[PDB]
Amino acid sequence: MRIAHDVTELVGRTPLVQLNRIPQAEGCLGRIVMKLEGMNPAASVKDRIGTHMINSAEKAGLINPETTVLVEPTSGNTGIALAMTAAAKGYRLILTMPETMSLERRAMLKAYGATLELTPGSQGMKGAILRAQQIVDSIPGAYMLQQFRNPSNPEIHRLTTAEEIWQDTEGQVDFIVAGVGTGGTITGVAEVIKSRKPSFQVVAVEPFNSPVISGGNPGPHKIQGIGAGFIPEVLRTDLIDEVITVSDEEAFQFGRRLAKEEGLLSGISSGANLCAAIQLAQRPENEGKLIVVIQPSFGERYLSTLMFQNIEERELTL
Amino acid sequence: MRIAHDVTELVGRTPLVQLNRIPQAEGCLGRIVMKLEGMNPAASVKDRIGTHMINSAEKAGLINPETTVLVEPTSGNTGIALAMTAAAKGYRLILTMPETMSLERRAMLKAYGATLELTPGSQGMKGAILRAQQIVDSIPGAYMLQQFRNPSNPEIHRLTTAEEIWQDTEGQVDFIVAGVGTGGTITGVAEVIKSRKPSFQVVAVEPFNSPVISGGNPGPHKIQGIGAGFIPEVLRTDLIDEVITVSDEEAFQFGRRLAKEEGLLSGISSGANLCAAIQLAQRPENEGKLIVVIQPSFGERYLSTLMFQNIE
Ligand SMILES: *Cc1c(COP(=O)(O)O)cnc(C)c1O
Numbered sequence: 343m344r345i346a347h348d349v350t351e352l353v354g355r356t357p358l359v360q361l362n363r364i365p366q367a368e369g370c371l372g373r374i375v376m377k378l379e380g381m382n383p384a385a386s387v388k389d390r391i392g393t394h395m396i397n398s399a400e401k402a403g404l405i406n407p408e409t410t411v412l413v414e415p416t417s418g419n420t421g422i423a424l425a426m427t428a429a430a431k432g433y434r435l436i437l438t439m440p441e442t443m444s445l446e447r448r449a450m451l452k453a454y455g456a457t458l459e460l461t462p463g464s465q466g467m468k469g470a471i472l473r474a475q476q477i478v479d480s481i482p483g484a485y486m487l488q489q490f491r492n493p494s495n496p497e498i499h500r501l502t503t504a505e506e507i508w509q510d511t512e513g514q515v516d517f518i519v520a521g522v523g524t525g526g527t528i529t530g531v532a533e534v535i536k537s538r539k540p541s542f543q544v545v546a547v548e549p550f551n552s553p554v555i556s557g558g559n560p561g562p563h564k565i566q567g568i569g570a571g572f573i574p575e576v577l578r579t580d581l582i583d584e585v586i587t588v589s590d591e592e593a594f595q596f597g598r599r600l601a602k603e604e605g606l607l608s609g610i611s612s613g614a615n616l617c618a619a620i621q622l623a624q625r626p627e628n629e630g631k632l633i634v635v636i637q638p639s640f641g642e643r644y645l646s647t648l649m650f651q652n653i654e655e656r657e658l659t660l
Numbered sequence: 661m662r663i664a665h666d667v668t669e670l671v672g673r674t675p676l677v678q679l680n681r682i683p684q685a686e687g688c689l690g691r692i693v694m695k696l697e698g699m700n701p702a703a704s705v706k707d708r709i710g711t712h713m714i715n716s717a718e719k720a721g722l723i724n725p726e727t728t729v730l731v732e733p734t735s736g737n738t739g740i741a742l743a744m745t746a747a748a749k750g751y752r753l754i755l756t757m758p759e760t761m762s763l764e765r766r767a768m769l770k771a772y773g774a775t776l777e778l779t780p781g782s783q784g785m786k787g788a789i790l791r792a793q794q795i796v797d798s799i800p801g802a803y804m805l806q807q808f809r810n811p812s813n814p815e816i817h818r819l820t821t822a823e824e825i826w827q828d829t830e831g832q833v834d835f836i837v838a839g840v841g842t843g844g845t846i847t848g849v850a851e852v853i854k855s856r857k858p859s860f861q862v863v864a865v866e867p868f869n870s871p872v873i874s875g876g877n878p879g880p881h882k883i884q885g886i887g888a889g890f891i892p893e894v895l896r897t898d899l900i901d902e903v904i905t906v907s908d909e910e911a912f913q914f915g916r917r918l919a920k921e922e923g924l925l926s927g928i929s930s931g932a933n934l935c936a937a938i939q940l941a942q943r944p945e946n947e948g949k950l951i952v953v954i955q956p957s958f959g960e961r962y963l964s965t966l967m968f969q970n971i972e
């Protein structure tokens with residue numbers, strides 16, 4: 343009988359889909375397909391690390407539902423993934439965040455029964471991290487996921503994401519194009535596929551306004567999900583063949599085009615990923631080559647984010 | 661290579677998941693599992709009919725993306741599904757709705773590039789239907805999908821939803837519990853499975869203040885997605901064994917419990933479905949029986965619509 347024990351067994355195994363209009367309109371020579379991480383149970387790639395970081399820590403005997411309080415600073419999708427996972431497996435979870443985070447995302451975390459603690463909006467993610475550290479020190483048995491440093495983050499991408507790409511393309515994949523958040527996705531795929539296919543190339547994506555992997559300064563940008571303004575510990579920097587930078591407006595416009603010309607409602611990072619993949623596919627040396635690009639999230643979350651953001655902007659003017 | 665041509669090929673094939681806390685805490689004797697329609701590409705059961713109603717019409721040679729303007733009087737998940745399908749297959753799509761529609765669902769429809777035609781609030785759904793008819797009659801080749809009347813609606817559920825339930829339970833399924841919106845889901849499942857297993861039982865769900873299938877009067881309610889205030893043409897009332905009515909607050913509460921106790925963020929109609937399933941599963945005669953419950957949508961959409969009306 344095909345009945346899952348709980349929702350955490352339903353993450354990953356996401357499909358590939360070809361693009362029928364955008365690459366053609368852009369005169370692409372390479373072949374672009376999208377991996378739909380938006381089709382995870384809670385609609386983002388995170389679901390893979392939300393589940394595995396906890397599974398890994400359980401399997402190692404570090405954590406237990408009856409005793410361990412989970413803690414993590416997070417203003418993005420990892421919080422949602424952890425909240426779902428914790429509710430499914432019976433964990434108490436505390437998430438810390440800046441007050442600036444969308445009300446929609448706060449309601450999402452609370453809906454899953456996560457405990458929220460807000461931190462000053464000016465202190466950014468830095469205040470959230472410091473507060474998260476206190477809470478772990480305050481609670482015996484407590485455990486910090488540390489998504490940017492946790493080895494089980496790239497591990498799950500090695501074990502699942504990479505194998506799905508390898509199998510579904512039957513070894514034909516020539517490129518991965520992936521925006522870097524924690525860097526877990528691109529790293530796991532790079533580690534596995536480069537070891538089987540040395541010709542396989544790895545293309546990282548980051549905001550133009552925060553071009554840190556390219557060697558520039560960190561900065562404010564609007565590509566939610568990528569570009570944390572430092573180089574994450576879990577990122578295998580040695581495996582990256584190229585970084586492409588994408589403006590906020592490019593990322594947004596290609597997101598609009600994915601929705602309207604392909605029927606793929608996606609977050610802004612999907613638009614960033616595609617933008618970079620388009621440039622890559624236009625290069626003559628890449629004709630006939632198979633480019634896998636990640637859609638990190640379904641776009642409905644981002645849409646309500648933009649809606650609440652617009653409401654707040656109009657009431658804060660003058 | 662295992663690569664879909666487009667997103668419409670990624671619809672359905674949704675998983676079953678067991679519940680580990682709610683039925684146990686309610687002293688259930690039957691076994692409850694949820695079918696997660698929230699895992700469709702645009703996060704609702706609708707994706708099946710949005711795609712298939714268009715697909716069926718193409719194979720009948722009635723429509724073509726190059727010439728056909730699609731039209732439907734809908735504000736809800738069907739609109740979203742049709743908009744995704746139209747965008748994926750290259751169709752122009754016009755959706756009509758009263759001007760009293762939630763901006764989140766309007767925003768979603770525009771995100772997919774659907775054309776929206778708003779109708780007066782005073783006219784309700786009837787005004788949207790009438791305007792949709794006028795648009796159709798005005799445009800040569802234009803085609804209305806008519807979700808409540810279209811036979812391809814129950815068809816897709818016969819061909820996919822029912823087969824997935826049958827196969828995934830290896831024929832062991834004893835009950836389907838599903839709220840009725842168009843009634844396509846419950847009808848398609850009933851038709852196929854009752855044919856294969858006469859003992860199999862069909863339990864419909866409707867709102868307490870609109871108990872129309874039970875034989876009552878249409879009224880207002882908060883269970884989004886079900887209870888349209890009439891019996892749809894596509895619903896096969898003859899195949900239903902029992903109707904359970906659920907209140908707004910019961911549906912909402914069980915929705916909350918799905919989120920917090922199972923990690924299954926679901927719409928309010930999932931809460932209503934589960935509520936009915938719990939009562940069913942508490943009956944001694946149903947001990948050990950396998951109850952399949954529809955989760956019609958992922959709950960992010962509904963949570964979002966709630967918050968915007970808390971500002972409106
Ligand atoms: C996590 C995430 C990324 C990047 O994924 P990593 O594995 O963390 O590099 C991109 N976009 C969105 C929306 C995300 O949630």
Ligand SMILES: *Cc1c(COP(=O)(O)O)cnc(C)c1O
Nearest residue numbers: 737841842843844845885929956
């Ligand atoms: C469609 C829908 C239902 C009922 O499905 P039908 O097949 O139309 O009966 C229930 N809830 C929600 C949220 C829906 O979108």
